[PDB]
Amino acid sequence: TEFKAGSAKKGATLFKTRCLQCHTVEKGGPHKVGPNLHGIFGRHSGQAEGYSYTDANIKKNVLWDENNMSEYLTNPKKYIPGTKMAFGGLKKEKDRNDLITYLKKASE
Ligand code: HEC
């Protein structure tokens, strides 16, 4: 959205051993370490009711889109007060730029 955009770079191989380790963009995703994302971006924070979420994320309504999301992906444990998301942060806008770039795809 605002980033320098990507180019279907190494995004797929990213999520795999980056988010997949926790999550599942798919629908069938029964949920593992984290809730399912799917075609996020546009909704208000978490979008899963069946699965028990956190009282921090849901309590944010951080309308996902592109930059925002990344804004959290980087520092999810700061922005979100009480994020069970044990990610830490990529701190590498480089990948981040590709993350969303591809994410949007994976999400769609
Ligand atoms: C495990 C070490 C994680 C990795 C790697 C990533 N995520 Fe994550 N995410 C994780 C948790 C434990 C949670 C919170 C769930 C809880 O209830 O404990 C999250 C949350 C998300 C969210 C918001 C959903 C929500 O649960 O409220 C998003 C949009 C999200 N995670 C996306 C996502 C992406 C795209 C990642 C790879 C770049 C990723 N996460 C990594 C755990 C883990």
Curated annotation (Swiss-Prot):
N6,N6,N6-trimethyllysine: modified positions: 77-78
Record flagged with keyword Transmembrane: no
Subcellular location: Mitochondrion intermembrane space
Miscellaneous section: Present with 7330 molecules/cell in log phase SD medium.
Post-translational modification: Methylation may enhance its transport into mitochondria. Methylation occurs in fungi, plants, and some protozoa, but not in animals. The precise role of methylation at Lys-78 is unknown, but it seems to preclude pro-apoptotic activity, possibly by lowering affinity for APAF1.
Binding site for heme c: 19, 22-23, 85
Note accompanying the cofactor annotation: Binds 1 heme c group covalently per subunit.
Alphabetical keyword list: Electron transport, Heme, Iron, Metal-binding, Methylation, Mitochondrion, Respiratory chain, Transport
Role description: Electron carrier protein. The oxidized form of the cytochrome c heme group can accept an electron from the heme group of the cytochrome c1 subunit of ubiquinol-cytochrome c oxidoreductase. Cytochrome c then transfers this electron to the dinuclear copper A center (CU(A)) of the COX2 subunit of cytochrome oxidase, the final protein carrier in the mitochondrial electron-transport chain. Isoform 1 (CYC1) is the predominant cytochrome c during aerobic/normoxic growth.
Transmembrane segments: none
InterPro entries linked to this entry: Cyt_c-like_dom, Cyt_c-like_dom_sf, Cyt_c_1A/1B
GO cellular component annotations of the record: mitochondrial intermembrane space; mitochondrion
Family to which this protein belongs: Belongs to the cytochrome c family.
Coiled coil location: none
UniProt organism field: Saccharomyces cerevisiae (strain ATCC 204508 / S288c)
Pfam families cross-referenced by the UniProt entry: Cytochrom_C
Induction of synthesis: By oxygen at the level of transcription. Expression drops rapidly when the oxygen concentration falls below 0.5 uM O(2).
Taxonomic classification: Eukaryota, Fungi, Dikarya, Ascomycota, Saccharomycotina
GO MF, any single term: electron transfer activity
Cofactor annotation: heme c
Protein name as it appears in the record: Cytochrome c isoform 1
Example of a GO biological process term: mitochondrial electron transport, cytochrome c to oxygen
